[PDB]
């Protein structure tokens, strides 16, 4: 097999509000529930959030993983097609045309991504329910007009330190190197299709390049999302430092920095996975080009 996992497929719901990943915890919103555990431990009135987290948040997370796993049968079928399409030797030892296999790939890709969303729809509703319960729990803060913002500000300072650990410049360097090499390969295959008589090898390379393009798009999408999250929290740190605020304001403060930090934490893992997926595709492309040039040498 040329490809052993397809963790790089993701899907958003129709409202574009939630993004579902195959990587646990599957939604960045779960990391928000995790960050709120940290905020609540500094407010005596809401320390009971720890019991909400260990019951409702843990159950939601395990329900999310269960939903993802319901789609494993479609995933395995899709992996089977991918491995025929990427591998000329496997294509030559079956009898479906390359065009029929490509159409089946498109159908199974959308059925698999659709399963990831469909089986998680009730989980998305439960995110909204737990968010609402957190908003209600915050009512128990004693303050009303005079809520202190020191915990909020302290966590912004922590987040800025955490942001420095992320290889953000290296990710820019990587996706640029990779996009440029991708576009070079695409242009190169377009020339080879006229100079080299090897449609079995060329069609497989073209397919792998098509996959690489999908994964590049995902990388760029998640990279823009985490840069936006860092920029938003950085602008808070660079802006007017609050004094005391109303309880309603403090709720929104924690939801804002908790959700953007959750986006950052979730993007870390998603980008690392997509970087690995792109390196894996590079390996496959180069080995296919080895075959292409070796066949060309043989035909002189």
Numbering used by the authors: 30 to 329
Authors' own words:
Among these markers, the P. vivax reticulocyte-binding protein 2b (PvRBP2b), a member of the PvRBP family of protein adhesins, produces the top prediction for dormant P. vivax infection. PvRBP2b binds to human transferrin receptor 1 (TfR1) to mediate entry into reticulocytes. The surface of the N-terminal domain of the natural protein PvRBP2b (residues 169–470, PvRBP2b169-470) is a mostly positively charged α-helical protein comprising ten α-helices and two very short antiparallel β-sheets. We sought to design stabilized variants of PvRBP2b, under stringent conditions of minimally perturbing the solvent-accessible surfaces to maintain its antigenicity profile.
We designed six variants with the standard phylogenetic strategy (encoding 20–37 mutations from WT; designs WHT2476–WHT2481) and three with the ProteinMPNN-based PSSMs that exhibited fewer mutations (17–26; designs WHT2482, WHT2483, and WHT2484). To determine whether the designs retained the structure of the parental protein, we determined the crystal structures of WHT2483 and WHT2484 (19 and 26 mutations, respectively) to 2.4 Å and 1.9 Å resolution, respectively. The biggest divergence in the backbones occurs at the C-terminal portions of the α5 and α7 helices with up to 1.7 Å difference in position at His464 in the α7 helix in WHT2484. Comparison of the binding footprints of the human antibody panel with the mutations introduced in WHT2483 and WHT2484 reveals that the binding surfaces are largely conserved, with few of the introduced mutations being within the antibody bound surface of parental PvRBP2b169-470. These mutations fall within the binding footprints of human mAbs 237235, 283284, and 241242, respectively. Recognition may be retained for Lys248 and Met324 as the contacts are solely mediated by van der Waals interactions with the sidechains, which could either be retained by the residue swap or are long range (>5.0 Å).
